[PDB]
């Protein structure tokens, strides 16, 4: 009972720290996008408007790293409560320390204040002629900043209702279920599978198009792939695996984002199709209504199909008794066609009753078993 | 004592396990909850799992016992359950007492096992029980 | 190359 | 019983107004296609044939908007009948008003009579050379006219038999089914899943090819993608997601149609494959005939396979007794191969019998339950 | 196939049973090794053998859960055939 | 019992020989890649570093061929044990001899020491301008050396635990299961379907990229498709079927690897999507927890939905008694919307109960049968 108060308290602090790390993690990304797009034309990299915007990213990275450090200290304290340990050193394994440093390294890659340049030598596409430009070093540090999006998964998991609710923890314990980040992912793909793939696809479209444009702007003197609407077109024909080939990136950075879009788009489109195919299917309660109305329709069709069988059979007899060779021949072709049409509707009615009896098989078994009771 | 929100949510879980609202989880209610979850527990296993947390032995799980079970089950991994399962798989005969022969057999998958037996037999009954197993584990 | 298709392909 | 007469009376009026809205809605589109294709050729935009043909689109838009307004007045009246309200103001929610204005806005976009022009500057493909042309303003108002095809969905729903039939409504109420436009879509995809996907693909082919040709004709002088058969070849290779890249559109209007066709063709081909794969599967009644005939064939194969086992076994003995080393060796290789052949057919027969029992499992259960009765 | 799945699930069950024997052996082996160094008053040695014991318990839990998942799959596939046996008995 | 010892001794010899055949088989491939890369720039084909490196491939091929011959001598002896023969000639079928010669022919194709050249004439891509070079003959013998990877499959089969274990052989005999190389493939695709496809995709990526580079280097004067990253990008968008077309091989060797990759990547991506879509599905135990928590949520939602129904109904009654026309109508609209919302949640709770009762159908049947006993 004593550890229940301390476990809930340490979970609230962990949840609060995860929210703030996303506030500063996303703020640094936004300021990175603002500074990347403005340092191109609005000012230069050796300005006071760039030393004051890149110090906001640096200041937000220091705060973000502090929130990551404090969050992982709260995880250590939570581990010592659950496992009953008293010394933090019992929690410091080789797998935990590696991931602590991995998150720090991922969250510490930001554009450092200053004007440092490197020589970027690329080769244009469709001619493979060399092109050398002096590029800022803040372009190879701005792109890795998108790796801070892993904090979104942490926020989604900690804010999940069933992750902490005592009703779900008790029910999950009976079935021996593990409430981890994979369980939240699988429940998302069952509740709203078309809202997760559509949001992911659109977010990837904007992020990949900006990443392609940012890299494909030092080696673009024609404003072909350095345009945002020309980068979205490139990413969209790669996601759908069309590949017109009229625009391909001139650099390995753009060629890496286009290769990542092709991999994601190969599976995302296939997953989306399966979603649109499981939503265009009649439910088990709408199939029974459809089959009920089909049975009534087929019964009415059989009445009118057999009526035509006899109507033409007597019309054949009336003209045959009247000694009309051509009329009787015409009414015998119609009679044979009417018999075939009667057979076709009778066969498709038999097929429907086969399907009706196939779905209501196990439910009929329950009724028989109840009677035997 | 626990705060208001925690007490309320634990009461909600307890009432989820207590349909009649009498304040105690009868074995029938636990059985029907388990059956509603796709499991098929027998009466023997149900009774065995209901007395694990039943402190007073009255045969029913009141709110304090459910709170103890929740405090044991809220963590991702519970050491007591794993120690009990290891003791079960160690006890091939199922009599509740792991003999020295079983203790030697489970290590082949001489002096060390004898030292383990000597240091684990706290009461000197010539064998190892569940309480000795959990004492050695802790 | 009259058209830009032929300009791009003959260069590649 | 009084409201039953008024509900059927108002449903007939709604069905009648939906038919006339589709007559005038499609008439404006057809005249738009005629006037668009002739203004480029026969006459100019300042002629008396364009003032007289764009007044037919404008006049049909006036009547179409009148039928949309009256149709929604019938839905308001039907609401006051079903819900037992006495004031139409109770039927005016924020969602209904928005959808009423959305339909009016969609159906009011037509080429206005008059000669208004705007400057269209586009960047050509594969060369990215600017091309400025004086385009008419009736090209940005003709493409949205294809959004009137939403009236086709309304007409299909209001003309559907199970939407109004008292036999289907009573049965649907038992199963708590909602007869909306989604239910009609699901029933079409089960009755005729291939006709729906074939009419949609062909209709999208002509509509998108014309849209590409109409937009990508102010910036085309080599008659490449401004040709109907050139646009019908660009669109098909995008639907199939081949993407040769020999022709790509020069405008943003032709580039947003190739993207739209690529998205639709990614899922349409996947849905078509599933349909063609669900029709090549033997039904439950044809699998029993196929399994019955396979069992007969395997029994006949086992008779001849074991016959060869003994035939070569004795042929081995005959030559061994005659002391023929080479002949006996040859007949022992044949005996071993005959034994392996006998085993293979015996194993494939056992597999078929297991497959027969797997399908005939629940039906066997029913017979046992009948016996216990 | 329907017969190869039963062979695969039968051999997997034997593998998981042997894995549980070796995983639970490590649970007690590290538990006693922790007790041996603790009684000898070796702080660092006891601490290391408590990290190993906690990891061994987690590993034993993982093999216990994957064995339970296998038994769920085995019972799920062998359901109707078991129903036939019960129905024959009622005759 | 005597044949049981011999069979185990012969199996151990066969497994040991397969291990050495893979060591020398892969060693010759590795030295081939080293010699191929170095013979381009470092030295020439008439150097003493090429005579001394192609004699390592030649010597390894001699030992590898000896291990293939000896391995098949043990298979013949194992045949004479299982089938109880005394003359090895009984095992010499026309299919075994063909496969013995096929393995020898495949494993004997290596770069022969000496400087041999042939005139390679290829027509470049796009321009289709003829190009001629005096390519060495050691390039048409190095590529077939990758066919020695079939020894990997033999090693995997022979090292499989259930292939020789007496526990698995006895159980497999009861079910009439053949432990051939297809069974090992199928079990790998059930245990680790993603690891097999990921390892195969990466291995095909590096091998196909090197094969294209090794073939294109003779007819490439602009380091376009003869670069490792230019061939690892060429064979990356063929696997994904993007096919940009900016880079295509100039020869019929690089065109036979692009064709092979397109076939392999057409199916591997579809199989990967199937694996991914199968790992994102809740298990039968996690679906009972999810449905249990959804039922609790829907019951609570029905409590708040019905509360709003009465709250707005009484607010309507309170304002009606106060003679406030606008307020009464405003709350009557809210009452209608509250009733619609209550109906929606009541229907989605009904759908969940139907889904719950559809997965506990056969299990409930077991409970009834146990009672009858
Ligand atoms: Ca109770
Ligand atoms: Ca109690
Ligand atoms: Ca014992
Ligand atoms: Ca004892
Ligand atoms: K494709
Ligand atoms: K393609």
Author numbering:
A (entry chain D), D (entry chain A), F (entry chain C): 118 to 490
B (entry chain F): 4 to 112, 119 to 147
C (entry chain I): 6 to 17
E (entry chain B): 400 to 490
Verbatim from the authors:
Small-conductance calcium-activated potassium (KCa2.x, or SK1, 2, and 3) channels are activated by increased intracellular Ca2+ to induce potassium efflux and regulate membrane potential. To enable high-resolution cryo-EM studies of human SK2, we designed a chimera (SK2–4) that contains the transmembrane and extracellular domains of human SK2 and intracellular domains of human SK4. SK2–4/CaM forms a non-domain swapped tetramer with four CaM molecules bound, similar to the previously reported SK4/CaM structure (Lee and MacKinnon, 2018). The CaM C-lobe is constitutively bound to the HA and HB helices, and upon an increase in intracellular Ca2+, the CaM N-lobe binds to a unique S4–S5 linker, inducing a conformational change in the S6 helices to open the potassium pore and activate the channel.
To understand how apamin interacts with the unique conformation of the S3–S4 linker and how that interaction inhibits K+ conduction, we incubated Ca2+-bound SK2–4/CaM with excess apamin prior to cryo-EM grid preparation. To more accurately align particles and improve the apamin density, we used a combination of focused classification and local refinements to generate a reconstruction in C1 symmetry to a final resolution of 3.2 Å. Elongated density in the C1 map at the extracellular opening of the pore allowed for accurate placement of the C-terminal helix (residues 6–17) from a nuclear magnetic resonance (NMR) structure of apamin. The C-terminal helix of apamin binds at the extracellular opening of the pore and interacts with all four S3–S4 linkers of the tetramer. Essential residues Arg13 and Arg14 insert into the Phe243 constriction to form cation-π interactions. In this position, apamin blocks the exit of K+ ions from the extracellular side of the pore to inhibit conduction. The most significant conformational change is in the position of the S3–S4 linker, which shifts ~2 Å away from the pore axis to accommodate apamin binding. Insertion of apamin Arg13 and Arg14 dilates the Phe243 constriction from 1.8 to 3 Å. Compared with the apamin-free Ca2+-bound conformation, the movement of the S3–S4 linker away from the pore axis upon apamin binding is accompanied by multiple conformational changes in the selectivity filter to adopt the canonical K+-selective conformation with four K+ coordination sites: Arg240 withdraws and frees Asp363 to form a weak hydrogen bond with a rotated Trp350 side chain while Tyr361 in the selectivity filter is rotated 180° and forms a hydrogen bond with Thr355 in the pore helix. To probe the interaction between SK2 Phe243 and apamin Arg13 and Arg14, we determined the apamin sensitivity of a Phe243Ala mutant and found it to be insensitive to apamin inhibition up to 3 µM, demonstrating the critical role of this interaction for apamin binding and inhibition.
